Amino acid sequence: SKLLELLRKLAEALHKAIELLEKW
Amino acid sequence: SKLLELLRKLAEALHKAIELLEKW
Amino acid sequence: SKLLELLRKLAEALHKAIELLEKW
Amino acid sequence: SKLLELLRKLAEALHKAIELLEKW
Amino acid sequence: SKLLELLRKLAEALHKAIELLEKW
Amino acid sequence: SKLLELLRKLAEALHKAIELLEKW
Amino acid sequence: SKLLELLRKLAEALHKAIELLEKW
Amino acid sequence: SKLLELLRKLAEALHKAIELLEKW
Amino acid sequence: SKLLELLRKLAEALHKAIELLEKW
Amino acid sequence: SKLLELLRKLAEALHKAIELLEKW
Amino acid sequence: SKLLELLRKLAEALHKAIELLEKW
Amino acid sequence: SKLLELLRKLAEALHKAIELLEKW
Amino acid sequence: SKLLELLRKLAEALHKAIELLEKW
Amino acid sequence: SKLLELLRKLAEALHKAIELLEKW
Amino acid sequence: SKLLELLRKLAEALHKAIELLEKW
Amino acid sequence: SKLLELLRKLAEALHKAIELLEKW
Amino acid sequence: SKLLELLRKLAEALHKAIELLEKW
Amino acid sequence: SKLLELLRKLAEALHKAIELLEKW
Amino acid sequence: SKLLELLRKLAEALHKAIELLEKW
Amino acid sequence: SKLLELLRKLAEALHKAIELLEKW
Amino acid sequence: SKLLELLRKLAEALHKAIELLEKW
Amino acid sequence: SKLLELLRKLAEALHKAIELLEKW
Amino acid sequence: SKLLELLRKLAEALHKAIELLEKW
Amino acid sequence: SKLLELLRKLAEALHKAIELLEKW
Amino acid sequence: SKLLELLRKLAEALHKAIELLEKW
Amino acid sequence: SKLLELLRKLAEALHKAIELLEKW
Amino acid sequence: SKLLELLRKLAEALHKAIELLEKW
Amino acid sequence: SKLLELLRKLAEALHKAIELLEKW
Amino acid sequence: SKLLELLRKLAEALHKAIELLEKW
Amino acid sequence: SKLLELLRKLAEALHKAIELLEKW
Amino acid sequence: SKLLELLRKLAEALHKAIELLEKW
Amino acid sequence: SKLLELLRKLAEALHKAIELLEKW
């Protein structure tokens, strides 16, 4: 489930990315 | 930035949805 | 309760989404 | 937008409704 | 009093809802 | 549809009733 | 005295109710 | 329907009456 | 004059009320 | 029913009297 | 001439009152 | 009861007098 | 019609009045 | 005393006179 | 004495009534 | 002002009139 | 105003007349 | 005295009343 | 007797009522 | 409080009137 | 019985209403 | 005391009011 | 069909609503 | 049970309300 | 009717949510 | 399964919802 | 306009995400 | 294939997200 | 704090991603 | 923006990287 | 294949590197 | 190919990431 790990990780990248955008 | 706040709700929704997917 | 928590996220999201629509 | 205000009212209701079901 | 919080929301909804229905 | 007027006014009573009751 | 607000709104319901009922 | 005509009048009275009481 | 309007409302009520008692 | 008829006259009178006060 | 209309209500009241008096 | 007759008659004078005044 | 009604009453007053005067 | 008799008679005369006048 | 005072009360009002009528 | 003098005298008479008849 | 001569004469008569019967 | 004044006013009444009737 | 009470009350009301109206 | 003493009085009267026709 | 019960309900409503208005 | 009574009355009134208009 | 249902529901709701807030 | 009954009442109210809104 | 299809959908969801917690 | 229904419904709602929002 | 492109892609992902998890 | 499409969906949105972030 | 949180997630994405790449 | 150099580099890397693992 | 081994190692290195960086 | 592009972007990350760490 290499792809499953990536999908949870991609969710993490987006979450932090948007938080920063929202702040700014 | 309420369009950005909607994005954040969508972002979190994907997260919870794929978090479930990853564990199942 | 991982599907129920996904539902809690999604609930929050739609509320703020429609609040944004009304605001915009 | 009064039809939108009904939709935002329902959204608030659903989020709280599912929050309560989810806590249970 | 979470059940009371849900029923408060349903009352708010119905106000805008039948307002709209009668008006329409 | 003065019956619609009655339903909307019974809604007024019920919404005031619940907000007061939910406080209590 | 949001109880006074409830009584006045229950009056609203009753007055609409009786005018409709007295027609009938 | 004379009894209904009296009770219609009592409802009208109570409107202005508790309006006034709450307002006072 | 809202206190006068309550008094005129009551007057209308009493006249009708006694008219009904008098017819009986 | 001569006292009851005097009451019917007097009922009418007070109504129009207070209506006049409100009008003047 | 609503002050005159109040007078007429008073006039009729005296009439009914004394009509009773005369017969008794 | 000479005075009783006069009082019913005085009521009659006034009643007609006011009707004419009201008209004019 | 009504003007003639006043005049009938004027006469009536005087007749009951003189009946009283003469009774004494 | 006979002055009161004439005076009653003249009251009665005008009443009867104008009873007819009004008819015509 | 009250019966005489009522005769005087009617007179007072009727003097006023016809004083007015004559000037009109 | 004849109309107001009439009103006071009407009221005087009506107080007296019904006071007198009420016990009887 | 030949007929208002008559009206006025009738009132003037019943003034002095009722004065006399009440003064007895 | 006031009886001859009663008779004076009855004369004025009669004079105008019967003048009318002949003028018809 | 209870009916006399109603009429007695109405005379009392009319007195305070006219006190107000003439006072204006 | 003239206008409030009037309101109170009107209410007492109506209560009695209706109490009797509720029995009747 | 249902018309009688409605009026008995309006009596309780108006009773409580005016009691509190007499306080305020 | 008095406010809780007035709310109980309005509820009882509106139960009865709507009972009857559901039948009509 | 549907309107009578909605009125019956609002009555039943408001019975329950006021039951509970009378206890609270 | 009373909180559950309140929510069941609001379910019936909202059911009927939206059914009719979907018609209109 | 986009906005009304949205309203309908929101309602269906809330009904299911509450139906389950009414059982629970 | 009934819970999956709720979430399935919410995805469907979100699709029509965003169709509207992006379309603006 | 990056924000709207993000919104459409979020929705695409969330439709797909939960479609995929729902049966599983 | 849907699991791969979700990876691409997250990417599309995240490209958009950081494109925006970098220009901000 | 939050900016450092993004950076941790950026790394995570790449590690799950390269794990997948290398698994193939 | 040395740290925004780093941010941008990380995204550019994961772009080509995920392109390659999805293209497999 | 050994290219993928180095590339996994560099991902892991940056994750570990910045884990510490962020702490400090 | 795209693996050497992955490695190019990992180098840019590393260069900036470790520059930061030495600059602390």
Side-chain angles (χ1 to χ4, degrees), chain A residues 3-4 6-7 10-11 13-14 17-18 20-21, chain B residues 3-4 6-7 10-11 13-14 17-18 20-21, chain C residues 3-4 6-7 10-11 13-14 17-18 20-21, chain D residues 3-4 6-7 10-11 13-14 17-18 20-21, chain E residues 3-4 6-7 10-11 13-14 17-18 20-21, chain F residues 3-4 6-7 10-11 13-14 17-18 20-21, chain G residues 3-4 6-7 10-11 13-14 17-18 20-21, chain H residues 3-4 6-7 10-11 13-14 17-18 20-21, chain I residues 3-4 6-7 10-11 13-14 17-18 20-21, chain J residues 3-4 6-7 10-11 13-14 17-18 20-21, chain K residues 3-4 6-7 10-11 13-14 17-18 20-21, chain L residues 3-4 6-7 10-11 13-14 17-18 20-21, chain M residues 3-4 6-7 10-11 13-14 17-18 20-21, chain N residues 3-4 6-7 10-11 13-14 17-18 20-21, chain O residues 3-4 6-7 10-11 13-14 17-18 20-21, chain P residues 3-4 6-7 10-11 13-14 17-18 20-21, chain Q residues 3-4 6-7 10-11 13-14 17-18 20-21, chain R residues 3-4 6-7 10-11 13-14 17-18 20-21, chain S residues 3-4 6-7 10-11 13-14 17-18 20-21, chain T residues 3-4 6-7 10-11 13-14 17-18 20-21, chain U residues 3-4 6-7 10-11 13-14 17-18 20-21, chain V residues 3-4 6-7 10-11 13-14 17-18 20-21, chain W residues 3-4 6-7 10-11 13-14 17-18 20-21, chain X residues 3-4 6-7 10-11 13-14 17-18 20-21, chain Y residues 3-4 6-7 10-11 13-14 17-18 20-21, chain Z residues 3-4 6-7 10-11 13-14 17-18 20-21, chain a residues 3-4 6-7 10-11 13-14 17-18 20-21, chain b residues 3-4 6-7 10-11 13-14 17-18 20-21, chain c residues 3-4 6-7 10-11 13-14 17-18 20-21, chain d residues 3-4 6-7 10-11 13-14 17-18 20-21, chain e residues 3-4 6-7 10-11 13-14 17-18 20-21, chain f residues 3-4 6-7 10-11 13-14 17-18 20-21:
Chain A
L3 189 50
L4 261 193
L6 175 53
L7 302 167
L10 256 168
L14 182 66
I18 287 168
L20 162 79
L21 210 181
Chain B
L3 183 44
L4 301 189
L6 159 61
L7 285 171
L10 269 160
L14 181 64
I18 284 181
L20 195 58
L21 206 201
Chain C
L3 163 57
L4 302 169
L6 151 73
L7 287 166
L10 261 174
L14 190 35
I18 279 173
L20 142 78
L21 202 189
Chain D
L3 181 42
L4 271 187
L6 146 75
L7 295 170
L10 248 153
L14 188 61
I18 288 180
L20 181 139
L21 213 221
Chain E
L3 183 50
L4 278 157
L6 154 75
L7 294 166
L10 258 204
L14 191 67
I18 289 176
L20 215 89
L21 200 215
Chain F
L3 187 71
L4 259 158
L6 173 69
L7 297 165
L10 250 184
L14 199 72
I18 298 166
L20 174 132
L21 207 237
Chain G
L3 187 71
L4 259 158
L6 173 69
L7 297 165
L10 250 184
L14 199 72
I18 298 166
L20 174 132
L21 207 237
Chain H
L3 183 50
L4 278 157
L6 154 75
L7 294 166
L10 258 204
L14 191 67
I18 289 176
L20 215 89
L21 200 215
Chain I
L3 181 42
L4 271 187
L6 146 75
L7 295 170
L10 248 153
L14 188 61
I18 288 180
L20 181 139
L21 213 221
Chain J
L3 163 57
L4 302 169
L6 151 73
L7 287 166
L10 261 174
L14 190 35
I18 279 173
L20 142 78
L21 202 189
Chain K
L3 183 44
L4 301 189
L6 159 61
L7 285 171
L10 269 160
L14 181 64
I18 284 181
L20 195 58
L21 206 201
Chain L
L3 189 50
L4 261 193
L6 175 53
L7 302 167
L10 256 168
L14 182 66
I18 287 168
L20 162 79
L21 210 181
Chain M
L3 182 47
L4 294 205
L6 153 76
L7 302 171
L10 264 171
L14 202 30
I18 283 190
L20 150 78
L21 235 181
Chain N
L3 200 24
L4 261 156
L6 153 72
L7 301 182
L10 262 184
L14 205 48
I18 290 176
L20 177 86
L21 198 242
Chain O
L3 277 141
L4 276 165
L6 142 70
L7 156 68
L10 245 156
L14 192 43
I18 291 167
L20 173 243
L21 274 163
Chain P
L3 311 73
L4 281 85
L6 156 55
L7 172 59
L10 250 169
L14 198 53
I18 299 177
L20 274 164
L21 99 82
Chain Q
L3 283 81
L4 274 106
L6 183 33
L7 179 32
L10 247 156
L14 197 62
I18 288 190
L20 262 196
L21 52 82
Chain R
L3 296 146
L4 299 165
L6 151 55
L7 187 58
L10 248 164
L14 197 54
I18 286 186
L20 292 176
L21 245 169
Chain S
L3 294 125
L4 269 158
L6 142 62
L7 185 69
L10 254 191
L14 228 333
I18 281 176
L20 181 227
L21 211 195
Chain T
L3 294 87
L4 281 89
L6 167 51
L7 156 63
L10 244 155
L14 192 74
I18 300 175
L20 273 155
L21 53 81
Chain U
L3 303 174
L4 283 185
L6 168 55
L7 178 164
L10 250 161
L14 194 67
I18 294 180
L20 295 185
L21 228 173
Chain V
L3 280 70
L4 285 335
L6 184 37
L7 154 79
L10 245 159
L14 197 58
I18 282 162
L20 217 171
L21 51 83
Chain W
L3 280 70
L4 285 335
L6 184 37
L7 154 79
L10 245 159
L14 197 58
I18 282 162
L20 217 171
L21 51 83
Chain X
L3 303 174
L4 283 185
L6 168 55
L7 178 164
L10 250 161
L14 194 67
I18 294 180
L20 295 185
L21 228 173
Chain Y
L3 294 87
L4 281 89
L6 167 51
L7 156 63
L10 244 155
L14 192 74
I18 300 175
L20 273 155
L21 53 81
Chain Z
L3 294 125
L4 269 158
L6 142 62
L7 185 69
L10 254 191
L14 228 333
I18 281 176
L20 181 227
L21 211 195
Chain a
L3 311 73
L4 281 85
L6 156 55
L7 172 59
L10 250 169
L14 198 53
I18 299 177
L20 274 164
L21 99 82
Chain b
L3 277 141
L4 276 165
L6 142 70
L7 156 68
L10 245 156
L14 192 43
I18 291 167
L20 173 243
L21 274 163
Chain c
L3 182 47
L4 294 205
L6 153 76
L7 302 171
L10 264 171
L14 202 30
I18 283 190
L20 150 78
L21 235 181
Chain d
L3 283 81
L4 274 106
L6 183 33
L7 179 32
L10 247 156
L14 197 62
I18 288 190
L20 262 196
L21 52 82
Chain e
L3 200 24
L4 261 156
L6 153 72
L7 301 182
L10 262 184
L14 205 48
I18 290 176
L20 177 86
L21 198 242
Chain f
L3 296 146
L4 299 165
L6 151 55
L7 187 58
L10 248 164
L14 197 54
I18 286 186
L20 292 176
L21 245 169

